[PDB]
Structures are given as structure tokens and as C-alpha cells.
Design a binder for this molecule. Structure first.
Ligand SMILES: Cc1cc2nc3c(=O)[nH]c(=O)nc-3n(C[C@H](O)[C@H](O)[C@H](O)COP(=O)(O)OP(=O)(O)OC[C@H]3O[C@@H](n4cnc5c(N)ncnc54)[C@H](O)[C@@H]3O)c2cc1C
Ligand SMILES: Cc1cc2nc3c(=O)[nH]c(=O)nc-3n(C[C@H](O)[C@H](O)[C@H](O)COP(=O)(O)OP(=O)(O)OC[C@H]3O[C@@H](n4cnc5c(N)ncnc54)[C@H](O)[C@@H]3O)c2cc1C
Lengths: 509, 509
């Protein structure tokens, strides 16, 4: 029979909970685990903010929307296994405004935003109306390969991973045989396609982003009615060993001079927790880098990956209104999102309140990168009280009025605002230190393989979305967790249970 | 005689104060100004934190150190004009530790850090010990041109501005005739030379950074004894019209239908302030982007520059100790700085406390870019109180013990720590939204010229360090301010006073 063994799961986000879910399902004799979570809260970047207990009065600060595409099958299987109430999420709605250079988009008009050279701007005339087509030409080949087989497509994409998106567009691809674009053409493509400055990160990441958001299969999207935190609730409920919150791991070690399976330990608040046969670290890499890892003897390049792999920032701001004025007054009855060059950048109309006539939540601002850092500078842990003006609220109200100026006035939007809002900047969260991995040029092809290198003789695993090829998605966390469990069972040669893992979990259970 | 005119200065940092200082010196008949500052505090990124009123018990959160090089002459002239108490600043000290891959640097040893291929790492053997030489070969030609004439050198540098530092090193320069470096070679150069990920920004910015920090003239450095805020005090004192604090400009406009000189206005807290013949905006670009600028009719590309020009992040953490253990125990008696791959990254030993035997301040962490964002995630407006652990303090104490392990133990460093510290993350400051401009590839050569474009018929100026070719220095703010004043006098044809400006201010007064 199997000897008694214990493993340590660092962090209680979806990766850590999924590891525990797999172990609980396999029911390996005499195997137990501790799950330590630094926060008082469980679920990590799955985080629903409830303004009240009212059915729809919430927004998702973390994960919100799921495209139903083959590479995401494991995520949807988790949704099914846990009985999640899925409803349609509308990525594109009806009547959503798009506002750039203070002009609204109009179909069938040349340069509606008046940013082209012909109109006194610097965007090349042959670019301004063509961003979709030109980026399709840039990304399209690789998206098609990714759609056939994600892993094979990814390996082929790695052959160009040395370039930033800007570099690829500037030079016409790796041999110069694709179209070459000037600075202002690329700037406009970035402005239309993504967050400020993000074309200065990996071309491969832009490709994958486009694969996920504009997938060749033209997928249905879903969200969880009641918020994504319902998944965390469901996952917690089934745990054989409950999450231990307020436990922040500060060091991880292995004693190589000890013959035992159980020769690993972690330190929490100066105290040693020992006897572990494997440690799965599930935290964002910023949190991992702060730990004292000397006791693991990590490869220097693996250590570099932990410090240097790039993370994007993201900020969300949600406001409550006495009625859904966007639905009633503006005819935006189907969800979707408005985009603009104004500071808010993106206004997302909830897909879960469409029938409500009373109080309603609007995700008024959703930003990334430098845009998110700038909104984030206004987001305080203790928002300013009414004896003072809230600069962030006034900014959002003013931007919303401009974006909605076709049907709304600032006065009306402000009058409908209830005075209740919430905002969150992920780079300001001490338990994450960023929104999610978005790698720089060369990182996937050079550093990532060392991040994923076996460590501590095969007993230490760096697990999570960053530790996968699908960054910024639940799927990345789940695939990473599944793969680490595979490696743990293999290491200890538990062949019955590895066979069972494959039988039950290969597509997810 | 000159008609009555009024101008508006937005923001009370060094740029805005300098504009007012110039106007006050010229004494133009019937000319007045308002200076509006959003903060309750004056001086912006000149900010000294005093722990107590004790002579040396402070650190500079903003500007701290000044190299005495020709391109900085205007800064030193300001120091002289205001009677600043300058003392030597030691960029390099004695006995400062350097720690990477958990090894201390040793002179005359091959790969002391054990990161080269020969030692089981990935840094090429021909790179690891040669970073200085290889970066000198990369930057050297341009540094020499900048040293001859900064403006001419800058114009020549613009011819390669399309490249990131990484790209320049990867491709062997613009025609491929310089050495070409692989990913891990570039990674190590970045690790040794700058903040995490910064080689993914403009090659030109890396050049200028190297020009400023390792200048061919091998300059003396200075700091202001008593802190940089003494300069703000001195500048405020002389103002003919005092700073109006707690006034946050939310919009700027010109009425083109009005024949008057005085046809510009700003909005503060919903209220109009009008009658201005020119407006000098001195704020960081993030703050400018949040204003409603429609009333200025800015060129679309000028608007893009405001949104898109890249800013770096920077974080500082200063701790007080009961005695200067670095001086007494470690022999670091001369200032300087320690560098490491640990989260703190840089530990700066003050140049102003060298003779003190009592309580003393250490700037324990000084970081940029992603390193600064990560430390910054632990920096709270209301730091956690002792009923709770302060994660940031424990991190700094642990890193300091590792960096100082040659002479110190964690226990001793912790015992000497008084429990008093202060930290600041500039990207979290709502009145800045970043530390300072650090442009991405192509930005200086493409967007910057539109940022600097005449606006509102020559009556609106975007002024500040970002609005110059020396980012991240007081000199950039002063040159920008001087140039905007020149343009204002020219616009209104005040030839006597323009001639006087040149006579008195061309090198600074
Ligand atoms: C703004 C935003 C929007 C997103 N939108 C979507 C979406 O629409 N769809 C989608 O599929 N995905 C989305 N995601 C991604 C998804 O939320 C994440 O990929 C996933 O939740 C990450 O889970 P994880 O377990 O890998 O990491 P985490 O959620 O970060 O879990 C790690 C846990 O470790 C804990 N921890 C940190 N340090 C320590 C320590 N020292 N000791 C112990 N514990 C520690 C943390 O508190 C945390 O709970 C979004 C992410 C963000 C940031
Ligand atoms: C971490 C750090 C270290 C540095 N170290 C050095 C150094 O060693 N040596 C050196 O020479 N330089 C250094 N600098 C640079 C120097 O501090 C800055 O370049 C300079 O102080 C910027 O001055 P400014 O007037 O251009 O901008 P700011 O200092 O940002 O002044 C702008 C002012 O506008 C105000 N404002 C913002 N929005 C509004 C609004 N809407 N309405 C009204 N007012 C508004 C702000 O509150 C601020 O006071 C450092 C900078 C940083 C961030």
C-alpha cells in the first residue's frame, strides 16, 4: 500500500483549488494536502464584487467572460462539473458607440474619426479604415494554425517570438516579405486593437489575444449568472481539506540530505511547515519572487524568468445607476462594449441585467497597460468621502457623457448615478502584483522554458496562468494545474493513479 | 505701454515655479499670472519626506542627485540663484555589495555570479563579465556626440529611434554591422544596466540614461543638504503671485470667436476662470489627458502623444535605524549604492549622513519599471498597523540581510530598525500617474514633435520634463519652461522682453 504522503498547495486561486479538486477525485490512499492562502479571501483573480445581495447587483473584478472554443474545453468542463449557471455573454451588442478624436463611428464612411492624412491627421489613408483587414493579414496564418491544433500552432508561432507586434508590422514579418507599416499606421492599429503601448510586447501575445477575442470559429460567449465567485464557492465546498487563509508563504525549501519523500518545507510567519513530498506554487510570479527560494537551488535562468516575465496591468470601475439608462435611453439593449480614446477606454454593458428596469450596474471603465495604471492612480483602498470630490467618479461621469452624447447629457447621467461605485487596480493588489502574464518579445521562446524546468529533483512546480501558453484565462490556470498533477504522479510512480488521471481528467472532468 | 495681460500656469512643480520665476524677473508691465496646483502640496516631483525636524532625518522621494555636466548647467544655475546648500553626492562609494544569483561580486574573477554557460547558466561566456564594454560599444558613439553638442547629438540619435535597446542589440544596429546578441546576453545586459524590462523601450532612452549616469566627462555629483524641497521653498518665497493649492484644472479652452488677447479659460471644480492670454500646462501627461481639451482643438496626433507617450514607474522605500550599521559594521563609509537581483534591486546609502553616529535613514529600496510596480503593490496610503505584519518591511529587512550578509545578520538589522519607515510609488500618485517619461521605440522621432506642436494659435503650451529631450531630470523641466516663455513673448511680439529673456536666461539666471 502507498506510504503516507502530504503535499503543499501555495495559493487558493482557481489553480490551487483545481489541484485539490483533482486529488480529491482520485482519492489516493494515505495522501493529504495543505492549502495555504495569503489572503483572508479565497479565489484570487476569480473575484465577484457584490454591492448588495440583490440578484444582479454585482460586477466581476477578475474573470468575467468565456468564449466557447475548443482550446477552452477544460474550463467549460469545470463549469459543468460544478453546476455553474451559464448565460449568454454578448461580446458585441447593438447600438454601442465608438468614439475616437471626438467623432462617432459611422459605417460606409471614409475616415469617420477624421484621423487620416487626407483629413489633417497622420494615420495613412490606406490604413485608417482597414485595421481589421491588415491585422488579419498579420495574425491570420497563425490564428488558423492555432485553430487546427493549439500546441502545434504555438510551436510554429515561437519561430517569430523574437519580435514585438510593432517590430513585425514595421519590418514586414521575419523576412520582410509582408507589408511594412510606418509608425503612425502601427499606432492606429494598436489604438483600435488593444491597450496603450501593448504592441511593444510580444507579437505572439497579440496573435493569441486575437485568436481568443476574434476566433475563426466565431464562437458563442458565456458568463456565470450571479458572478464568477460562484465557481470559487462550488470548488471550496467539495474540498477534503479546507483552505487555510491568512497564511502567506515566505520561503520554500527542500532538504536534499534527507532520504524521505517528505523532505520539503515552507515558512509562514517565521514558522516552518514541513513533511511535504511536493510543493505546488500557484501564485503570480511577483509574489513568488518575493519568497526566499534559496532552499530550492533553482536554475539561475528559472530565477530570471520569475523576476522578468512581463505582466500587464488591468483596472475596472463599476458604477450603480437608479435605472439602466444605456438600455432605456440609448437603445443598447444587448450588452457588448463601447470603445474610445477617452481615459475610460472601454465601457462594458452587462449581459446579466438586460431585463432589469430598476437599479443597475455598469462596468463603466475596463482598461489595460498604461491606461489601467493611469485610472489605477485614482483608485484608493479607502475612496475619498463626500466632504471631498471623488476625481475618479467625476472623470467617469464626464467620459460617459461624451461617449453617450448621442442620447445623453452629463446632467442626466450624473442624476441617475446613485453615488455607489467600486474600482479595482490589479497591479495594486499585494497578492498578485499585476493583472496577468503578457510576455515581452523573446520571453515565451527563451525564458518560459526555464520557468517550466523541473526543480528540486521534480518535487517543485510553478503553477498558474503565467505557467501556461494561455495567459489571462482560467484555461491557462487549469491546464497548468493538470500538468503539474501529472508530473507529481509520474515522479512518485503511481501508475494506477496516473492512468486514472488520464482516463478522467485529460479533457477535464 | 503694454495692455494688461494675464497668463495661467497649470501646476506648481519646478516647471511652473520656474515660469513664474522668469516672469517675476523680467517684470513685464501690466502682466500677471495665476498658478493653480491640484495638490495641497507644492513642488510636485520635488518632494522631501522629513521623518522629523532633525537635520538629516529625511529622504528625497522625488529628485535627489545632480551630475555636474554641461547639459545640466541650467539646473546648477537655478541652485546658485536660489542659494541651495550643495554637498557632494557619491554615486559610487566604497565597499558597496553587489549580489546576483546569490553570489557577491569579486574583481578579477571569471563569472563571480555563476550565471554563465560555463557555470550552468545561460549567459554567454563572452558576455557575462563584459556588459560595460559591450554597452559602451552600443551607446558610445552617440554618447560622444551628445557630449559635444546635446541637440546635434540628439538629432543624430533620432535616426535610430525606431529601435528598442533590445532590437538594436539583437540586430547589430540599423544595418546589422554591429555585434548581434542572443536573448540571454541582452537579458543580462539589462539586468546589470537598468530596471526589469526597460530594454524593451527606446534605444535612444537607454543611450541618454547612460549619457547621464556614465558621462564621458566623469563628473562630480551633488545633492542638496536638507533635501530637494529646500529648492521648492526658495522658489515659492520669491513668487509675486502665490500658488493656489487645491485647485485641479479639469478643462482648458480658447474662444476663437473672441478678438481679445485674453480669450482663454480653464475650469476648476465646475467653475470657469477666464481672461488668459496664454496657458502653460505643466502637469504630467496622464493628468493632462484626463482634462477635457476639446476647447483647444488639438491636432489628433498631439492628442495621441498625450495619451500614448510612455512613462516609467519608480518606487522608493526609506527605513530609519538606531545607528548607521552600513557605515559602522559594513565599512560603507562613502555613500554609493548596492545593486542586486533581489526585489529591493537597489540600496542607496545617503551622502548627507556620513558623519552621523545616531539615528540614520537608509534608502533601502529604489526601483523602476516592473520592479517598482511590484514593490509599489505593497505600498499603502495607510500602512498596516502592528496588530498586523507589514509585508513590505519584512521583505526589505530580509533583502537587506542577504545583501549585507558579509557583515550583518537579519537579527541585527531588524534589531537596529526603529519601526519607522516611509515608501512611495509614483505611479500611484493621482497628481502624476507615473514617475517620468521614458519613451517607447519611435516615440521621440514620431509623436514627440506633435506633442510640441503649436496649439490654440500659439497660446497653449505643454510644458514639463516629458516635453523635453532630457526626461527624468530637473533640467528637462527647466528647459521646457524656458522655451515656452520664449514662445509666449515671441507670440505677443514683446521684443524688449524677449531680448531681455535671452540676455538674462539663455543659460539660466
Ligand atoms: C482583470 C482580469 C480579467 C480577467 N478576465 C478573464 C475572463 O474574462 N475569462 C477568463 O477565463 N479569465 C479571465 N481572467 C484570468 C483569470 O482570472 C486568471 O487567469 C485566473 O483566475 C488565475 O488563477 P491562478 O490560480 O492561476 O492565480 P491567482 O488567482 O492569482 O491565485 C493565486 C493565489 O495565491 C495567493 N497568494 C499570493 N501570494 C501568496 C503567498 N505568498 N502565500 C500563499 N498564497 C499566496 C493569492 O492571494 C491568490 O489567491 C482575468 C484576469 C484579470 C486580472
Ligand atoms: C523617482 C524620481 C526620482 C527623480 N530623481 C531625480 C534626480 O535625481 N535628479 C533630477 O534632476 N531629477 C530627478 N527626477 C525628476 C524631477 O523630479 C522631475 O523631472 C521634475 O521635478 C518634474 O517637474 P515638473 O514641473 O515638470 O512636473 P511635476 O513635478 O509633476 O509638476 C506638475 C504639477 O502639476 C500638478 N497637477 C497635476 N494635475 C493637475 C491639475 N489637473 N491641475 C492643476 N495642477 C495639476 C501636480 O500636482 C504637480 O505639482 C526624479 C523624478 C522621480 C519621479
Amino acid at each position: 500500500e502507498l506510504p503516507p504522503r502530504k503535499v503543499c498547495i501555495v495559493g487558493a486561486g482557481v489553480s490551487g483549488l483545481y489541484i485539490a479538486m483533482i486529488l480529491d477525485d482520485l482519492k489516493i490512499p494515505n495522501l493529504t494536502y495543505d492549502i495555504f492562502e495569503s489572503s483572508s479571501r479565497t479565489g484570487g483573480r476569480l473575484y465577484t464584487h457584490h454591492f448588495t445581495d440583490a440578484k444582479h447587483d454585482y460586477y466581476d473584478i477578475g474573470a468575467m467572460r468565456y468564449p466557447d472554443i475548443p482550446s477552452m474545453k477544460r474550463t467549460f468542463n469545470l463549469f459543468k462539473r460544478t453546476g455553474m449557471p451559464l448565460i449568454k455573454y454578448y461580446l458585441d451588442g447593438e447600438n454601442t458607440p465608438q468614439l475616437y478624436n471626438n467623432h462617432f463611428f459611422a459605417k460606409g464612411v471614409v475616415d469617420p474619426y477624421m484621423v487620416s492624412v487626407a483629413n489633417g491627421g497622420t494615420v495613412p489613408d490606406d490604413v485608417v479604415d482597414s485595421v481589421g483587414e491588415k491585422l488579419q493579414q498579420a495574425f491570420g496564418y497563425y490564428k488558423e494554425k492555432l485553430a487546427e491544433d493549439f500546441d502545434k500552432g504555438f510551436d510554429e508561432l515561437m519561430l517569430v517570438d523574437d519580435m514585438t507586434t510593432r517590430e513585425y508590422l514595421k519590418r514586414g514579418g521575419p523576412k520582410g516579405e509582408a507589408p511594412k507599416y510606418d509608425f503612425f499606421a502601427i499606432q492606429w492599429m494598436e489604438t483600435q486593437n488593444t491597450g496603450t503601448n501593448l504592441f511593444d510586447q510580444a507579437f505572439s501575445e497579440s496573435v493569441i489575444d486575437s485568436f481568443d477575442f476574434d476566433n475563426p470559429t466565431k464562437p458563442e460567449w458565456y458568463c456565470i449568472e450571479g458572478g464568477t465567485s460562484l465557481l470559487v464557492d462550488a470548488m471550496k465546498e467539495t474540498l477534503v481539506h479546507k483552505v487555510q487563509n491568512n497564511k502567506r508563504v515566505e520561503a520554500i525549501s527542500i532538504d536534499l540530505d534527507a532520504p524521505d519523500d517528505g523532505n520539503m518545507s515552507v515558512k509562514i510567519g517565521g514558522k516552518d511547515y514541513s513533511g511535504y513530498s511536493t510543493v505546488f506554487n500557484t501564485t503570480a510570479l511577483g509574489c513568488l519572487d518575493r519568497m526566499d527560494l534559496r532552499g530550492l537551488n533553482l536554475h539561475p535562468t528559472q530565477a530570471d524568468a520569475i523576476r522578468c516575465l512581463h505582466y500587464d496591468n488591468s483596472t475596472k470601475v463599476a458604477l450603480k445607476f437608479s435605472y439602466p439608462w444605456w438600455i432605456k435611453d440609448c437603445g443598447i439593449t444587448c450588452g457588448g462594449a463601447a470603445s474610445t480614446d477617452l481615459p475610460l477606454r472601454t465601457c462594458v454593458y452587462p449581459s446579466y441585467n438586460l431585463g432589469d428596469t430598476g437599479e443597475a450596474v455598469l462596468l463603466a471603465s475596463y482598461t489595460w497597460s498604461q491606461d489601467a495604471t493611469r485610472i489605477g492612480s485614482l483608485v484608493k483602498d479607502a475612496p475619498p468621502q463626500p466632504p471631498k470630490e471623488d476625481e475618479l467618479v467625476e472623470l467617469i461621469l464626464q467620459n460617459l457623457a461624451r461617449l453617450h452624447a448621442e442620447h445623453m447629457t452629463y446632467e442626466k447621467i450624473k442624476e441617475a448615478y446613485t453615488g455607489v461605485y467600486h474600482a479595482y487596480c490589479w497591479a495594486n493588489d499585494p497578492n498578485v502584483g499585476g493583472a496577468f502574464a503578457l510576455f515581452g518579445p523573446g520571453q515565451f521562446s527563451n525564458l518560459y522554458p526555464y520557468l517550466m524546468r523541473p526543480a528540486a529533483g521534480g518535487k517543485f512546480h510553478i503553477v498558474g496562468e503565467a505557467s501556461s501558453v494561455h495567459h489571462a484565462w482560467i484555461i491557462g490556470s487549469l491546464e497548468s494545474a493538470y500538468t503539474a498533477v501529472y508530473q507529481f504522479l509520474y515522479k512518485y510512480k503511481m501508475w494506477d493513479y496516473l492512468r486514472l488521471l488520464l482516463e478522467r481528467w485529460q479533457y477535464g472532468l
